[PDB]
Every structure is written in C-alpha cells, then in structure tokens.
Design a protein around this ligand. Structure first.
Ligand SMILES: Nc1ncnc2c1ncn2[C@@H]1O[C@H](COP(=O)(O)OP(=O)(O)O)[C@@H](O)[C@H]1O
Ligand SMILES: Nc1ncnc2c1ncn2[C@@H]1O[C@H](COP(=O)(O)OP(=O)(O)O)[C@@H](O)[C@H]1O
Ligand SMILES: [Co+2]
Lengths: 243, 243
C-alpha cells in the first residue's frame, strides 16, 4: 500500500544501500550480513539490517532478537534495536506477494537517518532474490560463498543480476575457507580456497575476504551474542561515500 | 504401475534396508550414506544406494557418476555401478507424484541379490521424506546431524517417523563435529558437539559416531573419488542380520 515516490523520502535519509547475496543456502550470507553491520556500528556508523530472507531468517537469532514485537509510531514501524551496538533490524520474524512485503519494509519502517542499510537477501541467484533487488535497488552488493561453491558461473549470474538494478559488486567473501588450530596456529585450507581473489582479479572486484571456520563465531551466533565477536574480517572493507 | 506385492519379490533378494535421514539440508546426509555404502562394500558386502533426494542429488556426484545413463534388461532398469567397489546406484539424476517414483525405483530396478540397500532420503522430518518411508519401509534408519541443531526435538520427530513404518533407529552420526590439526593433531570441537552420545544414551540408541570436518573428504567428495576415502567412521557399526 506504499507509493514508489514514497520510499524516496525514506531512502533519502539512508547514506548507502548494500545487498548481501549468495550462490545458495548454508554459505553464511546472513552471518556475513551481521558481521558487516557490526563492522559499521563499531566504526561509529548508524546501521540498519532488512532481513529479506523469509526462507530461514537467521538475522534476529544472531542478535538474540526472538523478543520480536514491532511497535508503530508517527515515523511508522519502529525497528527493534540490538542492545550492544543499537543496529536497527526488520524481519517478518516479528509477526508470529513478498514483492510488496519488501515495499512495506522500505516504506512503513522508521529507519530514520542511517549511513548504511544492509539487506540480507533470500539465498541464490533466482527470481526470489531479484524481486528484492527490484524494490531495494542497492548501491552496492556483496557475494558470500564457500570455496567449494564460488564458480565464474555464480559470480557472473551475480554481476548480471546487479546489472538489472545498476548496483556495484563491492566484494567477494570466501566464508569457511580455512581453519586455524588454536594450539599451534597452523592453517588448513579447505579444497577450492583462494578462488575468491582470482575471480575478483578476473572480474575487477576490489574487495576480497577469506573468513575461516570459527568455533567462537558459531558459539556467539547460536547464543545470539554476535555483536561481541571481536575479529573484523572487514578491517579493510573500502570507504563508500554514504551521504 | 508396479504392484505392492510386486516389490516384495525384489526386496526378498535384499538382506536389509537402511534409510539415512536428517534434521535439514547441508548436514552431510548424502555423504554419510555414501560412506556407509563404502564401509559395507569394502567388508565384502554387495550394496545398493537408492538416491531418494530429488531436491539436490549429491549421490551420483560423490561416486563421479555424471555418466548418468540407465539401460533396461530382462531384470529391468540396470543400476550404474561405482567403478572401484561395484556399488549399485539409482538416481532420478540418470534422466535429463514421486510417491510412485520410489515405487518404480523399488520395482523396475534390477537390484539383484544384495546384503544392504541404503536409501538417501530427502532432507528433514517433513512429509517428503515420510512418503519414501511409506514405500521403502526400512528395517533400520540412521540420523545424520551437525552438532549445532542436534536437539531431542529432531531426534524425537525421527524416532516418531520411524514408528510409522516400524523401523529401528540404528545410529546417530554427528557430522562435522570437530577438526584435527594435521600439524599437531590438536582437536577443536565445534559448539554443541558431544550431544549425539548423550541423546543416544537418552533414547537407548546403540550406535554413535562423530565425523570431523575433513578437508580430504571434501576434496574426494568433489572429485567424485569418495570410494578412495580411507578413514572408516563406521569401523564399529554393529552387525545386522542381513539374510
Ligand atoms: N566462518 C564460520 N565459522 C563457523 N560457523 C560459521 C561460519 N560462517 C557461517 N557459520 C555458520 O554456518 C551456518 C550457516 O550460516 P548462515 O548465515 O545461516 O548461512 P546462509 O545465510 O547462507 O543461510 C550458521 O550456523 C552460521 O552461524
Ligand atoms: N565431515 C565433513 N568434512 C568436510 N566436508 C564435509 C563433511 N561432511 C559433509 N561435507 C560436505 O558438506 C556438504 C554437505 O554434505 P551433503 O551430504 O550434501 O549434505 P546433505 O546430504 O544433508 O544435503 C558437501 O559439500 C559435503 O561433501
Ligand atoms: Co595445530
């Protein structure tokens, strides 16, 4: 029930729209989304997360936000804040086709003035996650994949999808690429690891990052204490003009 | 088209029907299925795998069977053999509602005389993987799960499912439970690990196994050379009267 000119007034308050996308489920798209939100918050930035992943909404759980409950104000649907860093979150989860659902999330929600809105897309390169790009029209987008995914095929379906809304492909994230023994700091690289950097060099993408399988990230993910995860795999995420 | 009394003549040639099942996707159900097939073959046994996982058929890939071509004989639909150990495989994959598809797989396929038929179910505890239990009515079934999401809930939906066809729950497999540094042989246990043994003791299941995250299993899985995977996580899988 929200006009195309209506969202404009809302997104005008938002410095930069990043979308996070994946070849498929279980590659840690929502976890990365969360870690980028945490990166930005901790740098002093005001951050919003829109959970577009109706399939399996990981986002609220990661911030221990099962206390769903949206409330309505002058400004509209008040997003629930993460207690440690004040990140604003919106998820279907907070109500116990979607073409228009995203239009509401961009319309009726009081995002206020924030520097970055992170959209946790549905998984894959299908129509589902393209419908969301239709309405969110992001400035930037970030590919999340495991080594043993991460083909030029996938990366090209990704660059092509980003064409349909004119969005820059800012980075590849190689999630669960290696493991670092905490005893002896030995790394063991999972088969297919190192492809992110080669494909990035290949298609002229400027940001690569290889996130290991981290027991602590799994612990705190589960506990919903992700805001306390110390390691920043986005230490070197490039600046992005966000006025 | 295959009659209910028709399958009887076929399964009469088959010593024991094991079904492999999961709380959800990406927990390595198909990989375990494959490793149990390999365990049995290498022990001298004649083994069949029915790939009931139409969703995302991992099985043929694991044995490098993209040569997906069935042929028909007197005996019927000839399963394609794995080249190293002679395991017989059947998968929709070999043709480039399913209620009756499984009925064909159990009916029209020439399984011949074999000791074990392993059924790689669809993932989860939903209707999909229950339809297959209807027609396969397995003697035994094995739960595959990762630590994070190995709940009494899941295990009970599993024991309950197995009731509906009177099948024994033979084992729990905790897949990707830990990692062993190849430098210093240190193990690092993923959060939630050790639950399989507690739940098994709890619901009186006789077989537990914890499979680590294995770079080599990932390598050979991908290469489709799984038959050459040396480690047997079923070293101590109990005997099962299979006349
Ligand atoms: N680097 C990592 N180390 C350990 N666990 C991880 C890592 N990345 C993701 N996970 C876990 O893997 C699972 C899948 O991540 P998730 O974000 O749900 O993927 P997706 O967004 O594709 O569904 C979750 O349990 C998540 O916390
Ligand atoms: N213990 C393990 N170590 C490393 N990789 C594994 C392990 N178990 C499974 N995998 C890999 O994880 C992925 C998921 O396994 P799969 O059997 O396809 O899950 P499911 O059958 O439940 O969909 C595959 O790439 C598989 O080879
Ligand atoms: Co070590």
């Amino acid at each position: 029930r929200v006009t195309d000119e209506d969202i404009k007034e809302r997104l005008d308050k938002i410095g930069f729209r990043i979308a996070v996308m994946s070849g498929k489920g279980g590659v840690g798209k929502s976890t990365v989304t969360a870690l980028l939100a945490v990166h930005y918050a901790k740098q002093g930035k005001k951050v919003g997360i829109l959970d577009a992943d109706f399939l399996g909404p990981s986002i609220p759980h990661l911030f221990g936000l099962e206390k769903g409950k949206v409330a309505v104000s002058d400004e509209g649907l008040e997003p629930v804040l993460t207690q440690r860093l004040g990140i604003k979150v919106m998820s279907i989860q907070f109500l116990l086709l979607i073409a228009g659902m995203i239009r509401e999330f961009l319309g009726r929600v009081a995002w206020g003035e924030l520097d970055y809105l992170l959209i946790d897309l549905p998984p894959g390169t299908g129509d589902a996650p393209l419908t969301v790009m239709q309405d969110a029209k992001p400035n930037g987008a970030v590919i999340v994949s495991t080594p043993q995914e991460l083909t030029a095929a996938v990366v090209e379906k990704a660059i092509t999808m980003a064409e349909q809304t004119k969005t820059a492909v800012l980075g590849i994230v190689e999630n669960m690429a290696y493991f670092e023994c905490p005893n002896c700091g030995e790394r063991t690289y999972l088969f297919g690891e190192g492809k992110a950097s080669e494909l990035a060099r290949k298609y002229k993408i400027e940001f690569i990052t290889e996130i290991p399988i981290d027991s602590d990230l799994l612990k705190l993910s589960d506990l919903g204490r992700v805001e306390e995860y110390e390691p920043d795999w986005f230490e070197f995420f490039p600046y992005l003009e966000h006025h």
